[PDB]
Design a binder for this molecule. Structure first.
Ligand SMILES: [Mn+2]
Ligand SMILES: [Mn+2]
Ligand SMILES: [Mn+2]
Ligand SMILES: [Mn+2]
Lengths: 199, 199, 199, 199
């Protein structure tokens, strides 16, 4: 059993003019391909260390596992979080939760934009579900540290703010990218992930 | 007394084809300009917090101070570490120290390349001087964490591996950028910084 | 501007048998005294560094400033959070908020206990108020990182889980210390801090 | 694969008066026992997670694996680094290396003392061997982060500066513990570890 690079669920150019085809093609076919590959290498190294009881080797592998494993986790969610069919606002129970927990949809967007723009260096902004509290929650995570693994929050919507996610098109102006990405958020998918959290 | 953006000591296109003019112009006129400005804002906020004894506010300012202050420190060194007159190998006492501490110049390049490529997320690779030990030392630093402030090592040569340092030209292939940058290292400047360490 | 060691609101033995007198005496007159003395020294070095535009020195001083500054913040709150007259349950709107946000007083105790017992190495567990969400929130902080300065949450109740907070009495058994400290929680103070957070 | 708590090379009181019997007994039979028990439990969860390709669980387990795994690594070395027959100075090639790399035995002691006293929060000071540079090197590590797993340096001599390593005897005065522990350094073991690092 090995991890595999999921195909992108749309054409490389499908999110233009919000995120261009050169970015989507590099982001998926180079960056994500490399996370999956490095993750499988690291998992096998870890299995050997575990079989040997080599704790030094397990701990030495931790940064590569978190970075590439987190990369695999985060980008697998990210591709489904975007869509040419996206944009606009969610409906039904996700919308009501957003209004209840953040005041309004636009207040929510301000909070997730602020968490995303606020990342210094590489990282991600997330809308998550706090299972213990039974409500929504915003967090930012450094580098590829994944949401559920490092906070327990269930990921609903992630925004990649590594410079490779935007730089070719938006250069240093990360806020321009955040403004554009709202046009391609796949609220159908974020709703699916939210409803899976509730029972 | 305020910090100021140092002019680049050469034309934006001067390091082509190793680092292109679009990168140098954004890197200096957008990214470094923003570090200096945010650093001065943060220093003034810190002075007010200090005058008030507001320790919460001092600690809340720490990430912006380290990121933008480190950014100012690191990029101020970086521009002088590059030159259209660069490339090749150092001479005299710096060369002898490199051979003594790392075996050879090429062994040194391998070690600094490995530290630079090994940064996961944003960061820097450094050749530094360990004043206590009286010899050279390689370290990598995360995000804009500056060498001397976080390790005590005196900076001689830094390699920026934030994606903005290379992505427009080299895309995901960070090793291609590291290979190119050796052609523009200003060994005259690294020698000046080294000789200043010795007395 | 000159921070001072606050007088304790009771004598060192007032929280016995739950926290013994020797711990309280060492905790206040040695550990907290050192946070204050070290904070003042570090603040003076920061004034000198700001005056000189020495950003390296500012950043080098950060770990000591957060550790001792955070120590001053945290322990100043901690003393007021405990009382010989404490224990039992809170009343009124705080009790209502606890039932609403954590399900019950007992479940809140389990959650703050688990966050405090869960710190690996030195740190703190906090009950805090989230100003933006208008509700209570539990978080853990590493070392002396203070809650408001690093998370924006307003501190209501803190539990020190540095080993010096419990070791002389409870040795390695941090869960016995957590069980005992509920007997001396100054809910009157936590209620004051909570009511201050609302208009 | 089943890690075990190593028997101590001496009885719990053998390092008195420098480290008293109660500390040694708690340190080995409670703290180290817990690192081993927690490491084994965490390793079993990692085997389950690897078998399922559950990367979230792998990453969630990392803090416990490094803390308890690192605890196992560090404390297993620590016990062998101390002896009732210890103290004094090393001989031969280790003494030569110490004089060469740190100037003198006394200056080496000051440097390892300063690194150990300098840890804010929990951690370790290490004398290590740098395989690539072919010389000795001092470093500090936070919490239980182990030296070789996080730095590649080979451990020669470790000093535990978690508060449980000294508090019952020395209370807050970590410098008195550092002065006392030189009396029980097992230089025969440190010499064996050093000679193993060379061909
Ligand atoms: Mn990405
Ligand atoms: Mn840069
Ligand atoms: Mn304390
Ligand atoms: Mn220990």
């Amino acid at each position: 059993m090995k991890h595999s690079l999921p195909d992108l669920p749309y054409d490389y150019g499908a999110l233009e003019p919000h995120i261009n085809a050169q970015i989507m093609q590099l982001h998926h076919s180079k960056h994500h391909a490399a996370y999956v590959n490095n993750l499988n290498v690291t998992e096998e190294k870890y299995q050997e260390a575990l079989a040997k009881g080599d704790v030094t080797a397990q701990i030495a592998l931790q940064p590569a596992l978190k970075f590439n494993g987190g990369g695999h986790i985060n980008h697998s969610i990210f591709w489904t979080n975007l869509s040419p069919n996206g944009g606009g606002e969610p409906k039904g129970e996700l919308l009501e939760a957003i209004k209840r927990d953040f005041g309004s949809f636009d207040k929510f967007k301000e909070k997730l934009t602020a968490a995303s723009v606020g990342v210094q260096g590489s990282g991600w902004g997330w809308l998550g579900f706090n299972k213990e509290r039974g409500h929504l929650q915003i967090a930012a995570c450094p580098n590829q540290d994944p949401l559920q693994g490092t906070t327990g929050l269930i990921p609903l919507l992630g925004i990649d703010v590594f410079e490779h996610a935007y730089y070719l098109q938006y250069k240093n102006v990360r806020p321009d990218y955040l403004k554009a990405i709202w046009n391609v958020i796949n609220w159908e998918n974020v709703t699916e992930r939210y409803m899976a959290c509730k029972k």
